[PDB]
Design a protein around this ligand. Structure first.
Ligand code: NDP
Ligand code: NDP
Ligand code: TOP
Ligand code: TOP
Lengths: 157, 157
């Protein structure tokens, strides 16, 4: 199965200040809605709880705890390893859609990054990992909004 | 300024049966909405009338008549050269968003294509031109829907 990764980070690499995103870049989330439509996503438990489920997406949620989910559209996995083995029988394609921890543990398995950088440098204590130079930008487009943002697609070369 | 082009075509190349699109693929238009967000779009006058202005988007519309719009978000030009010269004072980027005529006229200026191919072969007045080998696919993603669709980004090689 193909592993993609989709994130939005500030220019200082912040993705998270506790359970919040410390910015609202009007329009950016349309990109996430476009590329996740009828896809399978892999999310950490904290990101899943803070951001909720959208319709027309399936979720693999990883926890080390006894946490569970009423949603029929969700499968809980005890590890990333297990989620990958599971997903591989359920889909051609999974989009890793966050957690700091999840991004750190999955970035090496990804063949395509969808990265949005927001024109702000806010307070924060979760950070996107460093992008290995095995990856190259193949597409980029700037957006003007309340806070500008840059969308880039990276492929593993 | 960089010229992109964004289109959605059936597998047989149909983009239009008169002023309608002969199909509705749930999900696909999210990609159009996310990539045109707060961008300048170049549209022919026929497409503009049949499909209407969207909010949060700027329009360069070309006519060979004295046709005009009812919208301070719209600039009418008598030619594509005039539209380009005018836009270049306002923006580093324009997305050509159709007409069959417009696509044919502008494909030679475009350095990035955003092409959605819908899994259907309907009847069609209007067709997307053939993609010259001057361009190469740099990204691709498949979507399952009521009608499946494939999204590809082509760059000028
Ligand atoms: C983004 O980022 C912010 C939060 O990111 P972050 O705080 O890192 O949260 P995450 O979304 O990365 O949630 C991390 C959680 O995922 C689970 N987890 C992570 N790695 C594994 C693994 N290998 N095996 C099993 N379970 C695992 C654990 O859940 P648990 O605590 O349930 O064990 C862990 O606490 C959001 O607010 C949003 O902006
Ligand atoms: N089983 C017919 O066919 C239509 C399909 O047409 P389609 O090709 O998609 O149309 P477009 O969306 O490309 O609209 C074409 C129109 O754009 C204008 N135009 C195009 N090129 C130029 C140029 N270089 N300079 C100035 N104006 C220009 C003209 O406006 P104008 O007509 O105002 O001169 C022309 O008729 C349907 O709407 C249907 O009713
Ligand atoms: C996993 O849950 C969501 C996460 C995000 C964050 C996010 C926002 N933008 C981009 N490009 N990638 C992301 N991962 C955004 C969301 O909706 C806009 C989510 O709703 C399901
Ligand atoms: C020119 O305005 C629109 C055009 C289209 C057709 C279209 C649909 N999908 C893609 N990817 N590109 C397109 N050009 C679709 C639209 O709405 C979903 C438009 O907004 C009114």
């Amino acid at each position: 199965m193909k592993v993609s990764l989709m994130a939005a980070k500030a220019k200082n690499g912040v993705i998270g200040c506790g359970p919040h995103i410390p910015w609202s870049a009007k329009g950016e989330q349309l990109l996430f809605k476009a590329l996740t439509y009828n896809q399978w996503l892999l999310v950490g438990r904290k990101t899943f709880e803070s951001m909720g489920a959208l319709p027309n997406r399936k979720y693999a949620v990883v926890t080390r705890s006894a946490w569970t989910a009423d949603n029929d559209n969700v499968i809980v996995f005890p590890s990333i390893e297990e989620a990958m083995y599971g997903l591989a029988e359920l889909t051609d394609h999974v989009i890793v859609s966050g957690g700091g921890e999840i991004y750190r543990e999955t970035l090496p398995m990804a063949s395509t990054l969808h990265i949005s950088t927001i024109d702000i440098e806010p307070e924060g204590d979760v950070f996107f990992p460093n992008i290995p130079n095995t990856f190259e930008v193949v597409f980029e487009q700037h957006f003007s909004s309340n806070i500008n943002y840059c969308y880039q697609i990276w492929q593993k070369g």
